[model samples]
Structure formats: structure tokens, C-alpha cells
Target: PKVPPGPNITATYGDKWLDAKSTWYGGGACGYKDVDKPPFSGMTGCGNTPIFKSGRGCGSCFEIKCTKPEACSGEPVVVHITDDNEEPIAPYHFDLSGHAFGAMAKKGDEQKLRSAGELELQFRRVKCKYPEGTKVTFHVEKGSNPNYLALLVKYVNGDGDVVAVDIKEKGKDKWIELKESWGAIWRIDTPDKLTGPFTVRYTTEGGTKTEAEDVIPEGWKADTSYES
Candidate 1:
């Protein structure tokens, strides 16, 4: 059966930078576990409600810049949405990582720009780029079981936002859908035991779909990474 497509948040040809405020942070609320690690490389940030989109914006990338402080380099710094910010100073506020925030300042004046606290900034959405041969990874979380399986999808390139995910279990011809549990995480609760060596199908924000079969083994374990 064909799964219905999700909202198309595809990028427009032209860019229209919007206003926002920026701050700095470390980890994030997305629960990716390995943010500072390879693939993510610490180039991440948190966005408010409008941007977070209740986790649908989990991997979305943005280009941000600050120009209020004299220390501001007036250059744009690209960052990914990896967390949520409840206390927003503006309709669009970005709590960038310390590394990403400092990237917008003059060479020797990072501290000066950071001290500004809430720097008036402008931002625009952009497509994400992954290294060559970067496969999409599925993180089977801590609480998966025979009848309940939860997955955290990661490392998607272009559109970034994974709006939908589906799975076809081993020896099954029908596809089972997974519902969004939280940031980039989806869950499938079944009355029957769900077996694996499952074929995984993912849908991005741009309505693009990709499927990987035989990637998740039948002996799947919790807190494991399954890359295809």
C-alpha cells in the first residue's frame, strides 16, 4: 500500500532572511545522544516553537547571522535544529551552540559578541549536506520490545526533516506505520510480536521517500545503531 505523503517543506529558490535573536548552548533537547560526535560534529542549535515544529524540525538546517555588536563579523553561520527553546525572545529565536554562535563574530572578538547575550540576528532555512556515503541510521532506543518498537532516525541529508517512517517486518508483505514519539523518534505498538530484518521506509519533509531492507537485523537490540 502507498503511504500518504507528508507536508512539503521544500526550499524556495529565493532566500528571504527573517529576524531573530541568538544565544548559545551545548547539548540539546532532541536526545540525539551523540551530537558533538562525528556526522553532527557539534554544529547544532535549538529553535523556538515556530521553528522546532514539535520535533518535525529536528534535522532542519538554518543560516544565521548577527550584526548588532561591533564584534559581529556579519557573516552567516549554518546550524542544524537539534533542540527546543521554550523561552523565546522573538517569534524566531535561535539558541545556537557556543561553537556556532562564535562563528558569526570577528576573529578576535568572539567573547565580545557572546557577551551581548541576545544578539539581534537574521536567519534562513537551507538544505542539509551529508558526507559521501552517509547512510541514514536508525537508533533502536532503550525501551524496545517484542510488541513495542521505537526508533530514532538520523543522518538524513537534503530535506533533513523526517516527517514519516514505516516498516515492513520480516516475512510480512504489509507495511506497518510508525508514529512520531518525539524529536526524530517514531514508535510502533502492536498486539503481535514484531519481528525484524525489517525493511525501513522513511519520508522526508519534502515528500521524498527512501527504503532500506535487511538493515535492521532480526536480533535487534536496544540502544543500537542500524545504518543502511
Candidate 2:
């Protein structure tokens, strides 16, 4: 299998687990003293909120640079990978509002949070423009393709969905078939050095039809080009 061609995908938002007393009080000696009231720890399920960070222990995000203008170009597009189910190692509760402190706190304050959550947060929220039917093409390199692949699609309408596609090659014919209900992120396997193009077409709401053309970038080795 060949690694698909596209921009690097990164997580945008995620969460962290902070000890109830530590979140409010750990900032300073005064903060620890402030946790002496009823429900003093904070609200429950605070760990479910999104945090902004990179690499390991809940609330991690990656920087995604789009190769094309339409996929993501205007602003920095951050991709976040989070777990759906998150549980605390110890018994605790915290407020969602203070999530920034627990999840994406600044400097030393982050140590107050428990290292129990996933490397990324459990909840993710992304704001970007992915016009329905926008196309993504994956170009194969000499020998770095993947046999089984996973594609996670995040939409502007706040619909986060994953469309699993299968890449199969019959002799010299490279093709992609959607293993699940296909919306986007299809897969394909191609020859190492071939000159050809493929397409992904689908219908959006109200039967509006759109299509994306996939081809190798001109004058570039191991590249992909997309057009809508």
C-alpha cells in the first residue's frame, strides 16, 4: 500500500484532566485554599471539553498545512485527534469554563492537571470552510503506501465524520472503493511512476452535483493535484 498524498493532518482542540483542588488552588497557595467549599472542586465532566495542545496526555493538537487553497489555506488549520470515551484515574470533577486551565493551561499551571486523559482531548471543535464536494487526492510514492488506511473528515457545519475507503489494485488498474457510505476520502493504489488521473464525484443537498479531479502534480515527484 502507498501512503496517500495530501497535507499533514493535525488535531485542533482537545481536553485535559485537572485535580479538582489543583485546578482552582494550584495556581498559588491562595488557590489551594480556595478549594475548601461545597462543590469546591468544580463541575463534573469538565474533562470532556476541548483543549488546545500538541503531543501526549489529553488535549493535543497538530498543525495541518494544506497543500491546496480550498482544503485549508487562509488561516492556520489545526487537526485534533481525541478519544470518544475519557475517564479519570482518580475521583474528581471540574468546570467546563476552566477547561482552558486544565486542558491548555500556560506554563507550569499544566502540571496541576492529571496525566490520565488521552494524548488528545475527548471533545473536538473545528472552524473551517470545507465546501461540500471539495476533493482530496492522495499521490503514491515509490514504496511508502499503506495497505489499510483511515480517513477522518471534519466539516465546517460541525459534522465530524469518518468515511473509510478501500484501495485495491487489479494488475495495472488502481481504484478506490468506499467500504462505508462514501462521502469523501476514498482510497486508491497506483503504480510507482504512472501518468494518469482519477475523479471523485458526489451529490450534496438538494441534488446539487459536484466533482473533484485528482492527478499527479505537474513537474513534481510524488505529488497530488486536486481541482473542484
What's model 2's TM-score?
0.29
Candidate 2 segments whose C-alpha is farther than 4 A from its true place: 1-79, 82-103, 106-108, 111-158, 162-194, 200-210, 218-228
lDDT of 1 by residue, 1-228 (tens): 699889666565337889987888643556677777766677788899989888778877888877888988888877878899889888888888887787789998877777777788888888776667777788887788888888877777755577789999778899899998657678989998776588899987667888988778997888898999
Least accurate stretch of 10 residues (summed lDDT) in model 1?
Answer: 7-16
Off by over 4 Å in 1: 1-14
Candidate 1 lands at a TM-score of 0.88
lDDT of each: 0.81, 0.29
Q: List RMSD in Å for every model shown.
A: 5.6, 17.8
lDDT of 2: 0.29
- Say which candidate scores most in lDDT: 1
lDDT of 2 at 115: 36
